[PDB]
Symmetry: D3
């Protein structure tokens, strides 16, 4: 559809991966309400499509997302934070059932780093940079900059970034555990699509159950997380893909999953 | 007693280290019911042995453990998994009170990675590989593979492995946090025994309390985890080894612990 | 004030950073009760000063802190713990609202490692070393040596250090996530003061909210932690520094925070 | 609007209370998808309405709600539950930030008891009956019938109701703590509206913060829940109603809250 | 089988309920090692029986259980308690998948109250009494006496019983939430068996899922409890009894469950 | 002493119970900073006094405590609450390791209800009343009024009291779980002292462990709470009172505890 701030298209072979690109190179991909709206619409369309198995959220080659639009929240009041339209539709990424890969190129600061952290996998470019400069403008992160970041890179580095606003390179993010792979700036998006393709080639119902169990590691205690994982594991046997997948292995052949 | 799938013996000076070697070079150490039953028996006898202070779990030079036998759970239905005696004796390692070290040589896939992740310390070989290919056969990890992994390597890398099934090298595991030390393939087992020897050289009662204190980090909040650690710290003053160890510091000599 | 174990002074330009140096180059900065008292007093004075924005905790070039004085706790009984004046004023550093940076040079063992882990940021020297040798004296870490360590470096490395007492290098500490920056031995203290200055230049009220939100990651679930972050983010709009910081950005100028 | 299964209207003086009634006497107010969709619409309309301060959910004199429509979920398969439009929009009532009072008359079984427990306050009639008969049809509660009930009436009584499917009288629910007030069958709705009017007479912002603080008790530990309550207590000081409410108290007059 | 301290028999029509009666009227059913072992054996036998659907745990008319045998743990030591197993095998009731009903007649003190609290449902006689007199002998509860009690009766009453050792009447336990139904002394066992029969008539697989859902209300947060309950609810559709139960309702007939 | 708002004295035989009375009949025992400062001092001296075993907190015959002084927080700013001295030192009552009983007579509103809930046991008079009218002045509870209340009386009643500011009778508090015993207005304090004396007749070190175990119910999961109870149960064997208490029981005599 006609989008002013993003470009939604299905990339890769078999049209199984959905690429959501943020088109705003004049503001370094500023996350305004209009952009967030289009982003949520695209995510819903790809999540409600049987062909799409995974989504790849990317930006530009110079900056993935420079965070929220300060020009909009400048004059916001405290009362305008609780009972208003402003800043309420940011956590839609956390309610998606299909895997979402984050291709980060250039600056990913504030809302951008929060947007990437909300995604399952994060692929960063050789020149990518992450930071939480909220402290430099008199505010703190508001979408996971102090919760997901701390759990990923630890307290020592999280405290520094959040309290100093300094940037970390893609290498430090890889070494700290924030990102899983570093790819060239020219092939970052292609590598993310290739990864999404491999993920979409598996049983979607099982992929969702897996994502749910992995995400449950930050909301439960290990003892209960294990029991919840085993219950989801038991439930996999109710699907036909489980029988097909295991039967293919014993017969030494490729499995043909039907998403059921 | 006789064993068909494992080799159990005591190693190290004074025979203070119990070695459990998975012996099935034809199935890449497939974790079948027979192997798990013998593994639990080997863990039990070493647990009830007052001479053994630590246990070392190892496999083969090419494969540590390939996971559960897919040929056995192929025909299993949902009703069987929930209330039938097939997949119910995998979590005995979590109940072992003595420290356990996992000498991972070669493939540690699926149940193997979980088996190693359930131990306290994991020593990996130069050519060791870890993966969670459950998604490739139409299922998800069922022994905490999505809980302990996520807590160690992070959501980004854990999500990829669980959703893509791709392998990670020993170097990637050491940098993430899954394994602590990388050893040559020919010296892995001996170095793990040498580490177990150092552990067994301390008071077992205090070694058990310390092991329980570390495990509490994944089951309680940081506030309550510190209070529990405080009470366990106070409990050490009720043992003779505490007085002996501290007295062995003021007096410049070697401590002679008595496990009491 | 006159101190016998520490040297409290305000370093850096404009006197915005408070430095607490443990001066005991004969027992490797053994954390005696008298030292802990002076340390708590210095922390209180800096925390109750409108000029100090951040604190830097450091020791000697050869040793940061060798842990609690075993000479004192040698003869303590089980009743003397749960019920006396012994080992009770250690966790005061956890209640300090202002950021604290740990400049670790040389040995940081036992209580010294826990003392460093209680801080928000840890800068380690090239020759610095961390360890938890409590197991060698018949005791276990009782001030967060297992809780804050396991959550940072992982179970495998934490279990090893706690059950073996081996020393990890500054490089390994950074790769695991315990420390954020590896600074030269001759410039460690200066770099830490510079970092503290960069933190003390931001809105103190916002810096406090940021620290508390990051600490919440270890006390709450990811869902509730995100909602607590939301309310804290909303509360920033009630301060004057929030508007000044954002207006300066829109106007492309420097922000002059008033700490309110 | 044109509702086929509900009757939404603003009752009470000043139209500050929104009444949502379920009109399906021929099915004991069975919760079908159409009924739930209309229920969610009425909730959103009253939530966005600036005049409505509280909502009152009620049914018939003989049945509040007899649970979900079994005729619809009869042929549903396991795959249908994890997809395909089925059973997703039931928890919308928990996201309503405004207080909701449940006026229960007659049968409140299964989904009806869950819907009542989802509300903040529950007023039951002299003849009201609560039960969880899911077990009698080969299923279990799926919208909190095993979590909120257990937390209110205890494990002993919750187990009996869930495992046996027996009913409890309004007198039993009040003594157990499930309902707060027992009103006559002829004046249950009026008393519920009166309670809603009293709640809609104070600052809506403070009412929202209060409701969130109460729900916080079931999502965190007592230590963290107290700190959030304290932070919310600090936050309300930024509102004008806080100053007006207290000023009126000091001056012995009626406070005129402006909801800001 | 041959039991010296208990009487295990299968009571009720169709032999679907297993009754475990503690036969020791000379020590008020003091829970000794031998008694606990026999109790565990009887539980295991009933749990591994395809006919028994529920278990009824009862004692004498004057005493259900007077707690652990002080004559055995008198000369015990801290070392013999932490490492050497002398007190374990008590939590065998927490691992039972089938519902267990506690018919409490007379004294239920210390271990007896803990034994009853570990069961799912508790039926108390008109003259039954509950207490935690551990404080009177210089000890505290050790089998969840403080955890399960505080979560049912409240902090005020729990604190009083634990710090004073006073007894509460069956009526008080009923109003507080520790007992669900008060039965006459001469009909307590029969009514308890009747309730067990009502539980032993539904799908065992679904009854187990329901019990596990209720037990989970004390191990995690509400938001996570709702998710697990919803997932377990979805899983019930993979069983045959679910379809049979719902089809019988639509057809207005009795359901014939087959435990699958 | 020279107190101006309270009357602290040691009542009961042998002077083993410390009575703290709030003397302010002209303000319904308003909790101002001066009262709280003296209350903390009275709690400190009684906690350090080796003869006092329990404390009893009481008010007047007409009012226990009418909440914080509104006239002192009227002109407070959002920055003052977060940075200034105002509204601090209220949680000291929760840090008292010795048991504390709350004798509530008359009004217990706002801060008074929270102050009473902070104690371990609450004895209420026949005419006592509890309420949380904070909502009527444009504020919410700020000392656990929602956390501890909801966890005791339930969500249904807690929501009503917090959102309507309605008063509940002493009978309602007893049936809900807020108070444990109701006593005549003329003998409330005497019965409270008698209860405190009973608690003071047992081993203080064990009484402390017991209180710590009960408070643990509101900070951890049921699984972890049970394990901590066991460790505290094991730690009790290191005390001499444990041996004395059990030795007296088997010998049918009265135990002479030595507080160690
Ligand atoms: C609860 C739901 C909402 C909560 C979400 C959390 C709140 C937030 O995210 S706060 C926003 C965080 N702040 C930031 O991330 C950093 C702000 N941006 C910057 O500092 C810099 O622009 C930076 C470092 C990224 C790159 O700087 P630089 O290369 O020098 O180029 P710069 O001139 O500044 O940017 C070019 C254009 O991008 C604009 N821009 C950059 N970032 C933003 C932004 N966050 N908002 C609005 N405009 C922006 C610039 O203003 C400029 O536009 P123009 O000249 O037309 O006015
Ligand atoms: C908690 C209750 C249970 C929960 C546990 C969680 C569930 C699981 O663990 S699922 C099992 C894990 N999944 C996998 O391992 C995917 C399997 N991929 C492989 O197995 C590959 O063998 C791999 C990559 C390890 C090595 O590949 P490769 O070197 O080419 O050897 P391969 O060709 O497969 O043959 C070696 C022998 O090992 C057998 N084998 C390997 N893995 C398994 C296995 N998991 N089960 C049974 N047999 C196996 C092979 O079938 C083969 O035997 P054979 O010639 O008689 O047919
Ligand atoms: C509230 C809960 C708080 C408690 C939480 C956990 C409890 C603890 O912290 S236990 C203490 C930590 N344990 C340890 O450090 C094990 C000790 N190993 C060492 O201390 C070594 O000295 C080490 C490795 C740091 C450096 O050793 P090295 O360079 O060879 O020199 P060394 O001779 O040992 O030290 C020089 C002086 O420091 C003293 N010293 C070193 N550490 C300590 C100490 N922890 N306590 C007392 N004195 C110490 C030495 O005794 C020696 O003094 P002296 O010559 O007068 O006898
Ligand atoms: C997020 C996941 C989704 C959310 C999970 C929640 C889903 C659930 O698990 S809840 C489903 C469980 N609910 C129940 O079991 C209660 C079922 N109802 C009954 O058992 C009885 O009707 C009962 C006990 C209320 C007594 O009613 P009674 O006085 O005997 O008269 P009865 O004839 O049964 O009812 C009159 C009409 O109501 C219908 N009715 C009653 N309940 C239902 C129902 N739950 N569904 C459909 N129709 C119903 C009856 O079928 C009958 O209609 P008709 O004659 O036209 O077929
Ligand atoms: C990891 C943790 C696992 C273990 C944790 C469990 C911790 C515990 O349970 S500690 C035990 C706590 N229980 C108690 O304190 C209650 C002890 N019993 C009593 O106080 C009283 O006997 C009471 C009130 C029940 C009834 O008293 P009363 O009616 O006057 O009759 P009484 O004479 O005392 O009892 C008759 C017989 O029962 C014996 N008996 C009663 N209780 C016990 C007991 N707990 N242990 C051993 N013998 C007991 C009596 O000693 C007496 O035997 P005998 O005449 O041969 O000496
Ligand atoms: C975060 C750290 C701090 C957080 C703690 C939480 C914050 C709070 O507690 S907010 C305060 C909440 N408490 C209240 O709102 C109740 C205020 N009290 C009342 O309203 C009365 O008790 C009431 C009407 C219920 C019964 O009182 P009543 O017998 O009718 O006569 P009343 O005039 O009100 O009382 C007599 C004297 O008591 C004074 N008084 C009563 N309550 C207070 C109070 N909370 N503060 C100051 N003075 C009070 C009255 O002002 C009056 O004094 P005066 O004649 O000199 O003006
Ligand atoms: Mg890491
Ligand atoms: Mg109750």
């Amino acid at each position: 559809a006609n989008f002013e701030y993003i470009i939604a298209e299905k990339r890769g072979k078999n049209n199984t991966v959905g690429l959501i690109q943020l088109n705003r190179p004049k503001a370094l991909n500023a996350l305004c309400d209009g952009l967030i709206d289009e982003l949520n619409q695209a995510l819903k369309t790809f999540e409600e499509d049987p062909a799409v198995g995974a989504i790849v959220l990317t930006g530009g080659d110079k900056a993935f997302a420079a965070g929220a639009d300060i020009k909009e929240m400048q004059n916001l009041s405290f009362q305008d934070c609780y009972s208003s339209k402003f800043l309420k539709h940011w956590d839609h990424l956390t309610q998606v059932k299909k895997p979402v890969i984050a291709a980060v190129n250039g600056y990913a600061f504030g809302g951008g780093c929060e947007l990437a952290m909300m995604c399952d996998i994060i692929y960063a470019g050789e020149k990518a940079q992450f930071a939480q400069p909220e402290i430099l403008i008199g505010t703190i992160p508001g979408a996971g900059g102090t919760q997901r970041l701390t759990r990923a890179v630890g307290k020592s580095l999280a405290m520094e970034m959040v309290l100093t606003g300094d940037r970390i390179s893609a290498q430090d993010a890889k070494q700290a555990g924030l990102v899983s792979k570093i790819c060239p700036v020219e092939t970052l998006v292609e590598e993310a699509i290739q990864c999404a393709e491999k993920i979409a080639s598996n049983s979607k119902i099982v992929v969702a159950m897996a994502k749910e169990s992995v995400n449950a590691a930050f909301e439960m205690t290990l003892t209960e997380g294990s029991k919840l994982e085993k219950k989801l594991f038991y439930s996999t046997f109710a699907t036909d893909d489980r029988k097909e997948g295991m039967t293919a292995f014993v017969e030494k052949r490729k499995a043909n999953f039907k998403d059921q």
